[PDB]
């Protein structure tokens, strides 16, 4: 369920992992937890993955129906107090959807948070799932403004890794995507952790690493 | 879990599953229900299997040190009042459902004894999730003063029909048979790729010689 | 959990509030702005509680108030303005709970400057001076001890300043960061404090 | 579970079903039916037999003295005249101690039936918890004997010969397992008499 | 519908040569207490097809209710013999009904089966149709009849032979060890002789008075009740 | 509660050689992984080994009280115990607390001795929390993973092997079940017990 | 105070080729510990390179079989094609999200093969997340059978590696692994049937399992 | 709480107790007793009672046709022949019914007596939930019946008469209140015939 | 509740905690002193929990090791005092439990520097470094990217430094004050930080 975005000088950068369980047990380990809302709009996955998926499509249908209605690009500030709306109408319900809306609209980058109980919130760095914590202790340790593009997508990587390396609900593969102007454009599709943590801690096979 | 009892001509006859369960999965396919408590007792049980093993160590030890002090044949009477009270002191929360067969100097004969406490002796009798087909079958043959070959197809009769209809139940048939003088075990009764060299990858590896 | 403070003088409206943004035991942001809500004209709506019903329940009666301005192409009094916040909250309360926590601060030609406290019962009430939160109860004996009639902006800002102290040296969560909105003068001010 | 105890003219009658044998042989002269749980009613039954056994020996005095099918069997009384036979009042009254410390947990009711030379033929009733009662015309117990009640205030009759009480209580045990649904099988019978006791099984 | 109060025992079903036969106890018990010995179990909804029960009484007779003005109605509108309708139909409405309850969450406490010839080419019964008032058997291939079991929770299947309550222990045992294929009516009658005697020695529920039911080319045919021999 | 702290045992035989294999993780509150050295099977006598899966404090709690009884019972003896004798120790040592019991379910492998010179038995059994005793003779497996080791040691066990076939197995079957469970892993070792000598290794499992 | 949701077990397995798909299922229905019939087919033929499996409530997934049966014959009729697997999917998500707070208790496994000659197998969950895998198990059996074809298939861990696969090997590695969890598992079935679906439609076959 | 019901030859008898008129008069030709809760039982009564006066006005045909103390009254028929009074099955029947519609709440066992032209004396029993079930012996309800059950089946004959009905009626009804310890009171009971109904009470 | 962090590393060990006496809504005090207890030789024990509970318990320990080595005039080993430790927390647990996480560390002769994590049900097991409290969740992570086998005192702080910050910025409870306890070279120092 680790999901992370961050705006840097170039747009912004999401990141996930992949893995999906029934409790104990993990049903799929290659799922998408990244949607094409719109032609400049993304959103993560966190919790309930039905719930998010489908209300997510179904935000997607409604942008789509006003995009064409009134001929102009919708806004994520738009996007994300539509979805917080339709998300609070269901209050009290059960539904544990937590979403990252990221994109790039006429007014700039935006980037907002979206939960279950309608909480939108608006900044720069954002990251919901079970390894939410670790992944935000390591983007803040190191994370800054104005770095070129090669070193965003390390910092993503590396930050999902960790957060999968002391995480069991969160592992697999690590998607991670960019947006700019026009678009998006995904930088690494899928990576198995495997080598990812044995060329980023354990460089040398030899022996366990303790830790 | 199935097992069933039955009283011959001067005789008993014992039978039993060889399947345990672990839930909604088989652990061992060939385990071993039948227990022997002397040279012309035996018992068969369903419950907690921990609960079933030891107390049926602690009878047999309890009624081989009686027969040695005393120098008297074991009476099967003995062993019932010993289960009935030990049970009983522990308020029935030690469930182990146990059927008792013996051939005591009063001759051969067969105890059903319950996780409460309580003891009643009867001409045949079947316990187990399987339980209720077995004693079915049981009841639709079961004739008085048989022989020992009608016995024993009688007793698979019921196991063998026991597998066949209940889930909880499966595997191989054991039968005993219980003679005032010596006994049977027939345990088997019925009974109804390879990897390259150093596919495996490996980053440790010591050698130590044992003296 | 999210600390409200209002401390309202004769010709001078300050209110106080925590800029955090809790989501289980980390902070969103440090620099929330979901917790006030300007009114059109003199009026403001401070709010605390759970982000989503205060976002809800301030954007609902804001944009009521200003389709009431602009219908009836006039200035809402401030008292009106409090007792429609206190009755839309009570009817939530009966069918759809609202857990939030408010400050009504306002200027009126009538009625000069107010305050209005509310619980989320909408055990509304007018008062000189109040608080919100469990930050409350570390402050508000502070507010009874310095203040006093004929004050002046600056005297409120030095208690609002030892009350954002005694919250960071005493108060469970330190917190540090927080915004004053001072209306005063016909003028609503924004300002940016760290203890 | 339907248990029935019946008072005739020199001798005592107590009968029983078979489902789930629920008469108990305590003493040659007294007999113990049981209703409830079967592990509580088990094992107090072997701790009174334990009792009586205990009793009867101690009270034993030093010298010399007193120079469908009906299958049945009878037991002729080893001890003539009672001398050491302990009374049957005696036994119910332990038993109900016992049942009364233990009312917490025991949950059982109990019928005695008996001959004693002090006052000739018995009926006690031990109820739930530690309740004693003695009973002159008959006592009932069990699901089963609920339905039958009235059926038997309205037969029974001062003075009942042998095959008059026989006859009663056999009709009363197969109404009660004609309409409870919880009884059945065999029916039981058991008739103590000053002499010797005779027991017999009826299959309809 | 909050729960069985006056409940059924249990109900045999298999199909043979010349049919179906189907076989249930004459009692309802009121929990411990078996307050009526004389209750007809087994209903009728055509000919050509049976409704079993075993569970609580009301909601059986609400659905024989049911079921019986189904086939009014579908008479009332009844022009060729092939317009009424087949055991299959009936078993799949029985089915849906139930699934409705379910989702409703105010089950029927019940177990239902109904068995029935679901072909019209061996008698003409169903030309000239007789609600009121009332040769040789012609074998029927196995192929032709329908039995099929409704539970609760609207689990439904089809079979050779359908048992329902406590007869799922005791007579599906004695039927899937000795049942045997175009059985003549006297075995098939032993057989269930001897499961409704298995379940009355080890059935407080069950009873001894017997009302068997055969569904044959004739139409539907209420034997006699009788005594298990024992 | 056996969430808290998963783990996961397995063993196999083959001919004239045995292996164990064990998960070395030690997490905590299920979703969070707190150490990656915390072995399983403890070597207690040269031809003896005991596999614990459960709550840590418990697995510790009871390989200290199986190492004093075997210290003790091999002092008093001057002789190395019996795979036999341990195993009956060992269940009567679970049941011994039935009522507020240890929360670990151990597996017992090694060597039965059989003298006349002298000959070696692969030995293997699994236990309950109350020590329900079942012997199998062939693979064997515990923990919160024990319905995939289960599943694949089924697939794979190819009854007697080599030592080098029955290592390639039961370490593909342990990576194999490891990889589908998320509260088990973080690298896992092996040991390959054999009269002459005996092997331990550590896989390149997967690390995350 | 009635709980409606009963497991009904079973197992259902699904295997993708370059150009084929396989998908496996038990044939018996059961209850908490005793078995209803030794028939009761899972797979369910949705269309002529498509079908579907479910496990679970029995009457449940015959309801949501029937149910897309008749939502695609309604598309057919009304659009005059057969909608692709992909549409099949879609539909089958918005059906299960439909009933979000009385879910369906059925896990689905639809298979078939695209337009463009690909073996595709979606496997969902009871409330309609769902995602395409080259290899999937439902019901009973799905922890004992799934790290056996992730081994099978995926072969992780391994240096050697062969992925030198075709229809046989494919078909008896299926048979393998349905006999392996019908000798390690109680509620899997006796009889099992193979749907096997290729460019030149589809077939079916039959294999008898252990009775226990 | 004791309701029984008797069918005799031409004719039916019902008696209940008085503790807490348990007996209703629907119609001229047809009577309920009612066991259970009070409130339910007396307004599923009412209910019933408008929904009979509804179907005995409708049935109605267009032309001419037909060219200790034991207090008593009796009532003669007005309507000769039963031309339009309603079926005691219907009414049953409909109660059947409105019982089930709302067996959640609804919690009471009623009895229905009454003539017919079509079927004669009937006597039908409407249990918990909505189940009904036509007896032709005999029918009971109530804690009291309980007791009275198997001594009934033992004295009831196929064809009796008036005065051995009402002597096994009143005898039963004493025997319940003798038991029973919720039931007492005065017994009241009513005879319904072919061509009267007639009712009375004891004090005894 | 209570953060406690732990570094070791060749021939170097930390020990981090911050300084709080939570009552209720308030801090009794801002610099707690019943977190660390030192036993006599190179030995330290750090405590989390409620108050009272690890006074109790740190007492114990300590002062039944002190009896030992005065008893038998020599030092506990390390690894023995931690396995006593475990024992004991064991033994309590089973009959009175003692909610309270451990963090034993010292240094000997025989196994050099070492640190040993304990939770509240004594699942103790050998670390190179770990964390205990809420803040936990946000420092382990950190410290996996930052620690490097041939570490230094210096660099062992500068992490701690890291930790700190990322405490203060983003964990809920806005932790401040730290005290550091560093054994190195046969000596035992005791730092104050304040972020």
Redesign the interface.
């Known amino acids: 369920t680790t999901t992370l975005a961050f705006k840097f000088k170039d747009g912004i950068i999401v990141a996930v992992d992949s893995r999906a369980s029934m409790g104990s047990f993990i049903s799929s380990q290659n799922v998408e937890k990244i949607i094409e809302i719109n032609k400049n709009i993304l959103g993560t996955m966190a919790g309930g993955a039905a719930d998010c998926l489908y209300w997510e499509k179904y935000l997607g249908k409604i942008i789509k129906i006003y995009e064409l209605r009134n001929n102009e690009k919708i806004s994520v500030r738009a996007a994300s107090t539509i979805l917080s709306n339709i998300l609070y109408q269901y209050k009290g319900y059960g539904l544990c959807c937590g979403i990252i809306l990221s994109g790039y609209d006429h007014t700039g980058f935006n980037m907002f948070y979206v939960d279950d109980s309608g909480k939108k919130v608006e900044g720069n760095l954002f990251s919901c799932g079970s390894g939410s914590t670790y992944a935000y202790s390591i983007l803040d340790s190191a994370y800054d403004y104005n770095l070129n593009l090669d070193q965003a997508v390390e910092l993503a990587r590396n930050a999902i890794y960790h957060a999968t390396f002391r995480d069991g609900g969160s592992g697999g593969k690590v998607r991670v995507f960019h947006i700019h102007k026009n678009g998006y454009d995904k930088i690494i599709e899928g990576e198995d952790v495997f080598d990812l943590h044995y060329h980023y801690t354990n460089p040398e096979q030899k022996d366990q690493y303790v830790m | 879990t199935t097992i069933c009892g039955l009283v011959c001509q001067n005789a008993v006859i014992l039978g039993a599953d060889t399947r345990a369960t672990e839930g909604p999965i088989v652990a061992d396919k060939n385990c071993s229900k039948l227990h022997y408590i002397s040279k012309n007792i035996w018992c068969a049980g369903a419950g907690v299997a921990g609960d079933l093993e030891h107390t049926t160590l602690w009878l047999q030890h309890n009624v081989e040190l009686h027969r040695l002090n005393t120098n008297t044949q074991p009476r099967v009477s003995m062993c019932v009042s010993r289960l ?2 030990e ?2 002191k522990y308020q ?1 929360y030690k469930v182990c459902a146990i059927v008792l067969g013996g051939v005591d100097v009063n001759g051969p004969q067969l105890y059903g004894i ?1 996780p ?5 002796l009867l001409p045949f009798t079947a316990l187990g999730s399987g339980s209720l087909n077995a004693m079915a079958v049981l009841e639709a043959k079961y004739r008085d003063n048989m022989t020992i070959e009608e016995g024993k197809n009688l007793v698979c009769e019921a196991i063998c029909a026991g597998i066949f209809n209940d889930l909880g139940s499966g595997g191989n048939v054991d039968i005993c048979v219980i003679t005032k003088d010596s006994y049977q075990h027939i345990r088997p009764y019925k009974e109804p790729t390879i990897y390259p060299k150093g596919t495996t990858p490996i980053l440790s590896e010591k050698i130590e010689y044992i003296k | 959990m999210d600390t409200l403070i209002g401390l309202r003088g004769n010709n001078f409206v300050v209110l106080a509030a925590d800029t955090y943004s809790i989501n289980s035991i980390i902070k969103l942001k440090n620099d929330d702005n979901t917790k006030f809500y300007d009114i059109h004209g003199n009026k403001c709506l401070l709010l605390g509680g759970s982000i989503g019903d205060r976002l809800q329940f301030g954007e609902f009666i804001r944009k009521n108030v200003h389709l009431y301005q602009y219908q009836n192409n006039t200035d809402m009094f401030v008292k009106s303005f409090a007792f429609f916040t206190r009755k839309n909250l009570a009817y939530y309360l009966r069918r759809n709970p609202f857990e939030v926590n408010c400050l009504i601060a306002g200027y009126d030609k009538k009625d000069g400057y107010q305050l209005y406290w509310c619980d989320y019962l909408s055990n509304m009430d007018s008062v000189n001076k109040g608080a919100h939160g469990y930050g409350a109860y570390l402050v508000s004996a502070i507010l009874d001890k310095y203040y006093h009639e004929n004050l002046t902006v600056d005297e409120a800002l030095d208690i609002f300043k030892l009350c954002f102290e005694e919250l960071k040296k005493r108060f469970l969560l330190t917190q540090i960061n927080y915004e004053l909105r001072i209306m005063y003068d016909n003028k609503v001010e924004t300002q940016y404090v760290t203890v | 579970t339907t248990i029935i105890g019946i008072i005739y003219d020199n001798g005592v009658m107590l009968a029983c079903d078979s ?2 044998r629920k008469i108990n042989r305590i003493n040659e002269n007294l007999y113990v039916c049981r209703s409830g ?3 509580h009613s ?2 107090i039954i072997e701790i009174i037999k334990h009792y009586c056994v205990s009793m009867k020996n101690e009270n034993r005095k030093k010298g010399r003295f007193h120079e469908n099918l009906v299958t049945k069997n009878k037991y002729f009384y080893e001890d003539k005249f009672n001398d050491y036979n302990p009374l049957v009042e005696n036994v119910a009254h332990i038993t109900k101690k016992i049942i009364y410390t233990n009312n917490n947990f025991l949950s059982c009711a109990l019928i005695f039936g008996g001959y004693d030379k002090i006052k000739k033929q018995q009926l006690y009733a031990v109820n739930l918890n530690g309740s004693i009662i003695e009973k002159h015309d008959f006592a009932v117990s069990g ?1 089963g004997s ?6 038997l ?2 037969k029974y009759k001062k003075f009942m010969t042998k095959k008059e009480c026989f006859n009663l209580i056999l009709n009363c045990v197969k ?2 397992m ?5 009884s ?1 099988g065999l029916i039981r019978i058991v008739n103590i008499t000053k002499s010797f006791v005779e027991e017999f099984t009826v299959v309809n | 519908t909050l729960g069985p109060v006056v409940t059924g025992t249990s109900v045999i079903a298999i199909k043979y040569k010349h049919g179906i036969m189907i076989a249930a106890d004459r009692k309802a ?1 009121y ?4 307050k009526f010995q004389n209750v007809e179990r087994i209903f009728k909804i055509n000919n050509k097809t049976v409704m079993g029960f075993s569970g609580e009484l009301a909601d059986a007779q609400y659905l024989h209710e049911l079921l019986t003005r189904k086939n009014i109605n579908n008479l009332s509108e009844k022009k060729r013999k092939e317009d009424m309708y087949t055991p299959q139909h009936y078993h799949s409405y029985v089915s849906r009904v139930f699934y409705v309850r379910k989702n409703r969450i105010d089950p029927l406490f019940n177990n239902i089966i109904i068995a029935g010839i679901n072909s019209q080419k061996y008698d003409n019964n169903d030309d000239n149709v007789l609600l009121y008032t009332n040769e040789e058997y012609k074998e029927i291939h196995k192929d032709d009849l329908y039995i099929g079991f409704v539970d609760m929770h609207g689990t439904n299947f089809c079979d050779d032979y359908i048992t329902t309550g406590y007869a799922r222990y005791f007579a599906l045992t004695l039927l899937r060890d000795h049942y045997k294929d175009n059985m003549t009516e006297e075995e098939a009658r032993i057989l269930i002789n001897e499961c409704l005697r298995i379940l009355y020695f080890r059935d ?2 069950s009873s001894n008075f017997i009302q068997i039911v055969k569904v044959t080319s004739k139409g539907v045919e209420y034997e006699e009740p009788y005594i298990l021999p024992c | 509660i056996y969430n808290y702290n998963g783990g996961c045992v397995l063993g196999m035989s083959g001919s004239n050689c045995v292996a164990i294999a064990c998960d070395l993780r030690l997490g905590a509150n299920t979703f969070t992984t707190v150490s990656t050295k915390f072995s399983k099977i403890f070597k207690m006598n040269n031809n003896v080994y005991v596999g614990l899966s459960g709550l840590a404090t418990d697995i510790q709690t009871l390989y200290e009280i199986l190492r004093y009884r075997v210290n003790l019972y091999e002092v008093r003896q001057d002789a190395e115990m019996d795979v036999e004798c341990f195993a009956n120790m060992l269940s009567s040592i679970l049941y011994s607390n039935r009522f507020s019991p240890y929360f670990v379910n151990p597996i017992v492998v090694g060597f039965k001795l059989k003298h006349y010179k002298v000959n070696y038995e692969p030995y293997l059994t699994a236990y309950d929390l109350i020590g329900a005793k079942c012997e199998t003779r062939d693979f064997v497996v515990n923990g919160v993973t024990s319905e995939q080791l289960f599943g694949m040691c089924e697939s794979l066990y190819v009854k007697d092997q080599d030592e080098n076939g029955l290592f390639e197995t039961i370490s593909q079957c342990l990576l194999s079940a490891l990889d589908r469970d998320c509260i088990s892993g973080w690298g896992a070792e092996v040991l390959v017990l054999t009269p002459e000598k005996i092997i331990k290794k550590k896989l390149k499992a997967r690390m995350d | 105070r009635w709980y409606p949701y009963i497991d009904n077990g079973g197992t259902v397995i699904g295997l993708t080729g370059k150009d084929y798909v396989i998908l496996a299922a038990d044939t018996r229905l059961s209850l908490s510990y005793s078995i209803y019939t030794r028939f009761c087919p899972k797979i369910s033929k949705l269309t002529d390179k498509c079908i579907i499996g479910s496990s679970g409530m029995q009457s449940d997934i015959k309801t949501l079989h029937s149910l897309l049966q008749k939502k695609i014959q309604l598309f057919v009729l009304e659009h005059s094609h057969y909608p692709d697997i992909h549409v099949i999917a879609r539909l089958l998500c918005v059906i299960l999200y439909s009933r979000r707070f009385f879910p369906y208790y059925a896990f689905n496994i639809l298979a078939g093969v695209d337009e463009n000659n690909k073996g595709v197998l979606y496997n969902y969950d009871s409330v309609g997340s769902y995602c395409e895998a080259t290899h999937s198990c439902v019901g009973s059996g799905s922890q004992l059978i799934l790290p056996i074809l992730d081994n099978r298939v995926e072969q992780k861990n391994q240096l050697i590696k062969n992925t030198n696969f075709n229809l046989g090997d494919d078909i008896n590695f299926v048979k393998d692994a349905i006999t392996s969890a019908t000798e390690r598992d109680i509620y899997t079935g006796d009889k099992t049937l193979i749907y096997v679906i290729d460019k030149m439609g589809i077939n079916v076959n039959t294999l008898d399992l252990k009775q226990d």
């Open positions: 009935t009270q049970l009983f029935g319950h409460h406490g309580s003891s009643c | 489902r789930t749980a079967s592990a088990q094992k699901s609920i339905y039958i009640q009235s059926y205030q309205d109404y009660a004609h309409n409870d649904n919880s059945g | 018990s929990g411990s207490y078996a407080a529920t």
